[PDB]
Ligand binder design. Structure first.
Ligand code: LBV
Ligand code: LBV
Lengths: 313, 315
């Protein structure tokens, strides 16, 4: 099963109970964005991140009464149609708001049962993606495909280190390709145990395909209330990319000397084949539109891995 | 019966009838569609060899001036990028794309690929979260039918085409329309089937390697290359990788007879085989700009993946 989260007086996490940390319900988010939850029917704002006032420019109480209808007039019917009751928690809808306080915000919404989860992040506003797609497809074998993928991602993102991390049948991981800035250690060829990416995180990574830590020294921002009014239970944040990263996992990034980290799931035959895994030495908020490019690349790599593995077997 | 290609018309080959369908060398027509321009150049020196006859009007230069310069001089910023992206021996399927600001012609999209020692350069005029939203909707579709319907509707919304069909191949290479989105008033093609020589054998092979092709105006005359043969080889210039390549006159008559002014299609490739086609019709001529066509190319790949996934959920 899982332990209760901390804020419901559950046990603190060790290297003895790695598998039972409830990574999906931390009750908090990373501070480079803001999150609201809301009722599926009424559009009634039920929870907000204590930092919402910053991003939205709204007097705190104003929000926690109001309706999405009021708050987001153009958007609220689109949401209603895009995310019908009963849809999967994996389905997401995005829009760009030109919002008074903040030039442009990206809005990302998904639905978990009766709750809409809304994420707001700063945003903005060429051929590198098309060029990359063809490059991946003409790679002659899996090894070269891995090399092209890591190089392409590094060029698109500027990340200090991009790796392709492949899982063995026992969930033992191996860095099979790597693109990195001059003057970093080389993780190429190294294997790491299966507990370094524990079972409950690999399951989540099979369904929700992109996650990040923007700053491995930043404090999480609580949800208020912490419990969902609807249920008097924890809000599932598994499908939110603003969800706080497990402190057990940020301690392992800090000990490695990484200040920023992103990964994309490569999913083949319904299973987690491997990860595009990115490091930055310093804090780094990759903007939403560039993340989208990596999300596309994730799908394309999933296709090409199968194609390429089929021409060996 | 499968038989080798006839020589093209310009090398004294025969004219194409319903008898010799499968033998038209559709990859070497010696000509392009008039909404863009094409140059060929030597892959090592960058000497310009062939150009479409309309090139002066896209590029704003006399032929003899174009042909008298190397790509190093014509494309000083792109020439080194081309050479890195398209190394000798690379496959003909690999494409490099850039946007140019050309004085006379505005923003041009440049698409380049390499066939042996030849570079092929295509120039076309070029111009929010719809793709991301579509990607997730496709993935959440519960079964093959719902996927097919979401895919057709999405493509129609992105493009404005009068008709978008998912056209699936059977094992005998007959095809059937299994989903479609269509303009009000058009008759349905849903569930109709069509014989295997409707898209014959030398076109299905080409459609497994080069995944997008189009006919922007089913009545437009093709524009010859000049000279027609590659001076490197005194042989035909391979154009199967060029979206500008003229369409078969037999295929253009087939669309005209259906009342179609513009046709486009994307290949859906599963396990190395052509599974189907995203097929679009418009009743009037219609040019879809290169950046919009890129969205369809990306959806072609997504759909190939999702078709595998939906079919595996099915035994
Ligand atoms: C007590 C459990 C431990 C643990 C937990 C844990 N790990 C993740 C996610 C990841 N761990 C990774 C480990 C590595 N990073 C590397 O660079 C290498 C090798 C070169 C390894 C082996 C990776 C890559 C991930 C994926 C996420 C990412 O890329 O940022 C989680 C889930 C965290 C979350 O969802 O927020 C958890 C709970 N990690 C351990 O090492 C042990 C001590
Ligand atoms: C003897 C010659 C024949 C012939 C040749 C031919 N056909 C193609 C390509 C296509 N034919 C298609 C036929 C259909 N269009 C539809 O709308 C339906 C059903 C609803 C069918 C069955 C299609 C869809 C294509 C693909 C191109 C496109 O999407 O428009 C070629 C190759 C063209 C080229 O590469 O330039 C050739 C040579 N087809 C015949 O029926 C006979 C007359």
């Amino acid at each position: 099963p899982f332990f209760p989260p901390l804020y419901l007086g559950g046990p603190e996490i060790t290297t003895e109970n790695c598998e039972r940390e409830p990574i999906h319900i931390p009750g908090s988010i990373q501070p480079h964005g803001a999150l609201l939850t809301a009722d599926g029917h009424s559009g009634e704002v039920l929870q907000m991140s204590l930092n919402a006032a910053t991003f939205l420019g709204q007097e705190p109480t104003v929000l926690r009464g109001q309706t999405l209808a009021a708050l987001l007039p153009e958007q609220w019917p689109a949401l209603q149609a895009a995310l019908p009751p009963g849809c999967p928690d994996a389905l997401q809808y995005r829009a760009t708001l030109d919002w008074p306080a903040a030039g442009h915000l990206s809005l990302t919404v998904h639905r978990v049962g009766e709750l809409l989860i809304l994420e707001f992040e700063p945003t903005e506003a060429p051929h590198a993606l098309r060029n990359a797609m063809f490059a991946l497809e003409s790679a002659p074998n899996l090894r070269a495909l891995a090399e092209v993928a890591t190089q392409t991602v590094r060029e698109l993102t500027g990340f200090d280190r991009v790796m392709l991390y492949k899982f063995a049948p026992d969930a033992t991981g191996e860095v099979i390709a790597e693109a990195r800035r001059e003057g970093l250690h080389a993780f190429l060829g190294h294997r790491f145990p299966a507990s370094d990416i524990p079972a409950q995180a690999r399951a989540l990574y099979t369904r929700h395909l992109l996650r990040l830590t923007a700053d491995t020294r930043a404090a999480a921002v609580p949800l208020d209330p912490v419990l969902n009014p609807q249920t008097n239970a924890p809000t599932p944040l598994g499908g939110a990319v603003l969800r706080a990263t497990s402190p057990m996992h940020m301690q392992y990034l800090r000990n490695m000397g990484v200040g920023s980290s992103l990964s994309v799931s490569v999913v083949v035959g319904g299973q987690l084949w491997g990860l595009i895994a990115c490091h930055h030495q310093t804090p780094y908020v990759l903007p939403p539109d560039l993340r989208t490019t990596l999300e596309y690349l994730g799908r394309l790599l999933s296709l090409q891995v199968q194609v390429k593995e089929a021409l060996e077997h």
